Amino acid sequence: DIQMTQSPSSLSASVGDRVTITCRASQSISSYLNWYQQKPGKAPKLLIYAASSLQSGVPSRFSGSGSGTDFTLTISSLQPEDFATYYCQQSYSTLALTFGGGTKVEIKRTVAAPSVFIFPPSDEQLKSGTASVVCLLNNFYPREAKVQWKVDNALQSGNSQESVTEQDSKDSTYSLSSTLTLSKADYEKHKVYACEVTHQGLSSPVTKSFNRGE
Amino acid sequence: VVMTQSPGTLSLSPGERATLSCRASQSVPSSYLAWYQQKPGQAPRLLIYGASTRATGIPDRFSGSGSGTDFTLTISRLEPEDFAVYYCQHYDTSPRFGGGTKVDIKRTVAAPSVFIFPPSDEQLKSGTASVVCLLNNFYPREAKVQWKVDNALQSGNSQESVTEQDSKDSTYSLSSTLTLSKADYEKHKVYACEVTHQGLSSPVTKSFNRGE
Amino acid sequence: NLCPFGEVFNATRFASVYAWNRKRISNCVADYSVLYNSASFSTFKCYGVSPTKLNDLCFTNVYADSFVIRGDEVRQIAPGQTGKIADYNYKLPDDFTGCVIAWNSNNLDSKVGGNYNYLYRLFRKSNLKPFERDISTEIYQAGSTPCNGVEGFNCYFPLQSYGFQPTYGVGYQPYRVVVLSFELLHAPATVCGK
Amino acid sequence: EVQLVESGGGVVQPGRSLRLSCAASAFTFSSYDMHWVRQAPGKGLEWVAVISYDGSNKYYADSVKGRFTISRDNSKNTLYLQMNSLRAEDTAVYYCAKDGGKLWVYYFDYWGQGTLVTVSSASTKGPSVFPLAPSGTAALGCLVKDYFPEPVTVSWNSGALTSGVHTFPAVLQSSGLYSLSSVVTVPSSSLGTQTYICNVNHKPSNTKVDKRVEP
Amino acid sequence: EVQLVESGGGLIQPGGSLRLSCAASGLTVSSNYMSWVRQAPGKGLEWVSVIYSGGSTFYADSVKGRFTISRDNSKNTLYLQMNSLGAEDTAVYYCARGEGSPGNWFDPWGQGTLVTVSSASTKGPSVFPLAPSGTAALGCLVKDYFPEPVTVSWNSGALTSGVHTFPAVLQSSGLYSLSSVVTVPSSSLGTQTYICNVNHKPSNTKVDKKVEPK
Ligand SMILES: *[C@@H]1O[C@H](CO)[C@@H](O)[C@H](O)[C@H]1NC(C)=O
Ligand SMILES: [Cl-]
């Protein structure tokens, strides 16, 4: 089995930058090396086949070169919608086709502060037995954001789950949702429910809170 | 194809017949099986190849047979010099060795000859005294060596070392080394190691007096 | 008329790998679909061409090489491989274009007391070039003293027998191999698919 | 304008069978090789099988050989993948792929949209939908909690509210079920005037829930 | 007169590199299968690497990517370059003609050379006499050396009967120590000169000690 090795595993470039991805083969595969682009939650899309042939309809900013064991995918001018994972795939061993590990391309961008919102658990949820407090960070960059839960000014960790959306194809910003899950017996025991946010685009941590039943 | 050798160690008297097994999880052809002998401190030596073909210069008392999942090495008329570790070896996609079988040789009880050695004056001028007790040519290996300095049993400042079974008489030899500073050595007179062994009806003590 | 692949695949006896057979196939219509569905194969690997694409391609000549090796050696019949078989018996180039077909032939090529008709070259000074065939039986000189065609110390017969027995493990059992090469010259093709 | 439309994914217990389909359009289907490629959740792409144009030759990866079967009905322009003896490792998104015909070797020029196959011995549970009441604009949403398996499709106003909608990826909580959040930011002026309803749909359990979101 | 004589063993720090040599006489290295087999202290035999006459090389998974086998035809010598050495590489290394396959067995074998992977330092030994008082006993004490091994002979090899050289013990200081003894008739103590020949290869230390009564 021919192993395909892609480098780097991940990279961050801004719009207009020149992006080059490398794919190496454990043995000579002649020129039968193909490149695919896969957006989050979407099927892969053929960009380059046979090392350097452009697939019909693919924009001109994509190109490829190489032979033998070293191959390259080049994005001449990176665009916002170019955020995806790029796979190489050898076709020399036609009955044992193998892919590379893929390279995730992320869009570098100027600083954007997140819009923080907090939600109390609904009345239909307390009727069931559980109680979830959801906090929302909206349209920020970079992804690295610290979400901290405070219940009666007591730090909470282990009761919640974070979730981040992939980079938006329009403005290249992220979004985070933290779900503080706790039982109804643990909900009425306390009063204050806050959500603290530490981010690179905040001169001072922002906190959005509410009082239970107010 | 994992090779498994059994038993781990084999203890037989001279003249007896040794049976060393080499089992395989999967079937291995006879022509892919070989046996190697390694004597203490020596390199391995080719014994049998092709399961049953004796190597050049190997005595007739070594023979091999078997196929598939069961191979056997046989040492007729076991001799004291046959004390060694024996490995089977095969080739599938790469060379693989078995775990090896140790062949110990049994013999009658032999009482040890005990000798004690004072530290040399050359070593004393360096600031350390090594007192050495020798148990020479005994069987079996079990022995007890006790150091007594001015009739006080010593503990925690001695180390032992045992040789392999001698290839000619199948006996063991043991050295016990008592280590002291020059200062602590000059504070005592009587240095003694006491030896208890199955070949001795009563413990044997060898001692010297520092200075005499 | 059709290309005669059956005379290679269905032959009652195969060649030793050191003296591998080659059938030059020319001036015929090749029917690969029936060929690849003609029997069950334990190894089917193609390089530089799809098996389903051969029905559309034309070649100047097609080569069908056949031989017998043991099970653990079938992996060496591929581009870029090394080992006793690839180095000293049958070598494929790094840019090999073709297919490698193998199937277990224990019921055909093993004997009760060991089938000693299938041999491979064990000793050789240098590696074979791709598609080279060496049928020499000269005594191999492993040392300084020349052998003068006499076996002895450092003087080895170059070939080794497999000794196929039907009770062996699959890694030691005989496997028949057929390699299809596709020679594309700057000349009018004679073998097209249908 | 080459389309490949797949279907047939869902929940299957280990050892059971499942059959996927993929209908082709707008190209000469009966003259191209067709492939199946799968992708485990969070992992890479793995080629599965290939079938010739006429359906006479079939080749499989070692990981599914003798366990999966590929077939085609050229009169219906449809490709099939029969999956028997399904193990937990078979949980993946399965794609059908057209073979580009410009080379001597295989390559995938057009892919289907994919269908998810989850090999598990659990039960398909419908989601519970709860509102997220809002309070310089505002934000409101819906919380899709305690459902299995993936996926759930969430829209706003039956597909009329598009801009400013963020549907977060699901998270597998410790209960084995999934929890999902979907929010949307609206101007703080039109809060008691405009109506907002999230459209949650869970096909594996056949659950369609519309919930009112009011401050 | 077929011999395989090894060299290159000794002390090497973890992460360092070493090259072993296997000079041959009675066979041509470039014309044979030549292998390396290693043996950790107190453990079994492990095949490591092989080179074919035609140039192919193969390695065990435990040494892949770190070892390199090679040969020099004009010197008729086999080599083994060992990189990135750790504690699991500490072993006696044997070279052997052959590969261990039918008609191609390991024969003959070199004498072996010990490789010690440690962070400590090379230290030469001190040799002290063990003086005697039917049969008498005398010997030599070889103390405070690192690493292994030391070899001891008596009267340049002319005295072999009744000689016992004990396995080295590791003192609490991290230095090794052993004794070599020999039993002789008490009558020859005055009319026979006894000399022990201590050789510590890793430090080029060769000591000849005449043992006499006191
Ligand atoms: C070999 O013989 C079988 C009948 O036993 C036949 O179906 C097959 O086509 C033959 N093989 C070839 C390559 O013609
Ligand atoms: Cl030593």
Please, what are the domains in chain E? 3-117 (2.60.40.10), 126-211 (2.60.40.10)
Which of C43, C45, C47 to mutate: most A Cβ within 10 Å? C47
Torsion of Cα atoms, B23 then B29 then B32 then B38, to 10°: 20
Q: Are residues C38 and C131 in the same domain?
A: no
CATH superfamily of A115-211: Immunoglobulins (2.60.40.10)
A37 three-class SS: strand
Each domain of chain B, given as residue ranges in start order, spans 3-105, 113-209
B68 to chain C, any CB pair closer than 8 A? The answer is yes
Number of domains in chain C: 2
**B113-209, what's its fold?**
Immunoglobulin-like (2.60.40)
Q: Are residues C145 and C170 in the same domain?
A: no
Q: How far apart are CA A111 and CA A133, in angstroms?
A: 28
Q: Which residue of C has its CA nearest to A26?
A: C80
Q: Do D57 and C48 touch (CB under 8 A)?
A: no
Q: How far apart are CA A47 and CA A84, in angstroms?
A: 12
Those of residues 100-139 in E touching chain C at CB distance below 8 A are: 101-104
Q: Do C168 and B29 touch (CB under 8 A)?
A: yes
Evaluate whether E7 touches E24 at the Cβ level (below 8 Å): no
Q: How far apart are CA A146 and CA A165, in angstroms?
A: 15
**A4-108, what's its fold?**
Immunoglobulin-like (2.60.40)
Residue matched to tokens 């801009």: D163
Q: Is A127 buried (19+), middle (13-18) or exposed (0-12) by CB count in 10 A?
A: exposed
Residue matched to tokens 């050295």: B175
Ligand 2 centroid–CA E116 distance in Å is: 12
Q: Do C87 and E52 touch (CB under 8 A)?
A: yes
Q: Are residues C154 and C99 in the same domain?
A: no
Q: Are residues C84 and C157 in the same domain?
A: no
The pair phi, psi for residue C192, each rounded to 5°, is: -115, 155
The pair phi, psi for residue A96, each rounded to 5°, is: -155, 55
Walk across the sheet containing C191-193 and list its strands: C28-30, C191-193, C58-59
Sign of CA dihedral D87, D91, D97, D99: negative
Give kind and range of the element (H or E) at residue A150: strand A146-151
Instruction: Give the CA angle between residues E125, E127, E131 to the nearest 5°.
Output: 160
Amino acid at D3: Q
Q: Are residues C119 and C101 in the same domain?
A: no
Q: Beta-carbon neighbour count of residue B139 at 10 Å?
A: 22
Q: Do E47 and B31 touch (CB under 8 A)?
A: no
E203 three-class SS: helix
Q: Beta-carbon neighbour count of residue C174 at 10 Å?
A: 23
Evaluate whether A36 touches A51 at the Cβ level (below 8 Å): no
Cα Rg of chain A, angstroms: 23
E27 to chain C, any CB pair closer than 8 A? The answer is yes
Among D96, D123, D124, which Cα is nearest to D110's? Answer: D96
Structure tokens at D139: 């934000």
Which of E130, E182, E214 to mutate: most B Cβ within 10 Å? E130
Residue D151: is the preceding peptide bond cis (ω within 30°)? yes
**Rounded to a whole number, what is the distance in Å from the CA of B175 to chain E's nearest CA?**
8
Closest ligand to the CA of E165: 2
Q: Are residues C30 and C18 in the same domain?
A: yes
Q: Are residues C108 and C118 in the same domain?
A: no
Are B3-105 and B113-209 equal in CATH topology? yes
Q: Which residue of B has its CA nearest to C165?
A: B29
Ligand 1 mutation pick, C38, C101, C105, C180, max ligand atoms within 8 A of CB: C38
B32 three-class SS: helix
Structure tokens at B32: 């892919």
Closest ligand to the CA of E168: 2
In angstroms, the Cα distances linking E119 to B133, E116, E143 are: 33, 10, 20
Q: Which CATH number fits domain B3-105: 2.40.50.460, 3.40.30.10, 3.30.565.10, 2.60.40.10?
A: 2.60.40.10
Q: How far apart are CA A32 and CA A30, in angstroms?
A: 6
C72, C163, C168 member nearest B93 (Cβ):
C72
Q: How far apart are CA A103 and CA A105, in angstroms?
A: 6
Ligand 1 centroid–CA C35 distance in Å is: 8
A184 three-class SS: helix
Q: Are residues C35 and C69 in the same domain?
A: yes
C58 to chain D, any CB pair closer than 8 A? The answer is no
Resolution (Å units): 2.4
E21 three-class SS: strand
**Rounded to a whole number, what is the distance in Å from the CA of A84 to chain D's nearest CA?**
13
**Pairs of residues, one from chain A and one from chain C, whose beta carbons lie less than 8 Å apart:** 26
Q: Beta-carbon neighbour count of residue B87 at 10 Å?
A: 24
Q: Which domain holds residue C123?
A: 114-165
The pair phi, psi for residue D95, each rounded to 5°, is: -115, 140
B117 three-class SS: strand
Residues 6+ apart with CB under 8 A from C185: C60, C61
Residue list, ligand 1 pocket, CB within 6 Å: C 5-6, 9-10, 35, 38
Q: Are residues C83 and C154 in the same domain?
A: no
Q: Do D61 and A32 touch (CB under 8 A)?
A: no
Task: Give Cα E1 to chain centroid, integer Å.
Answer: 21
Residues 6+ apart with CB under 8 A from D124: D11, D148, D149, D204, D205
Ligand 1 mutation pick, C10, C12, C34, max ligand atoms within 8 A of CB: C10
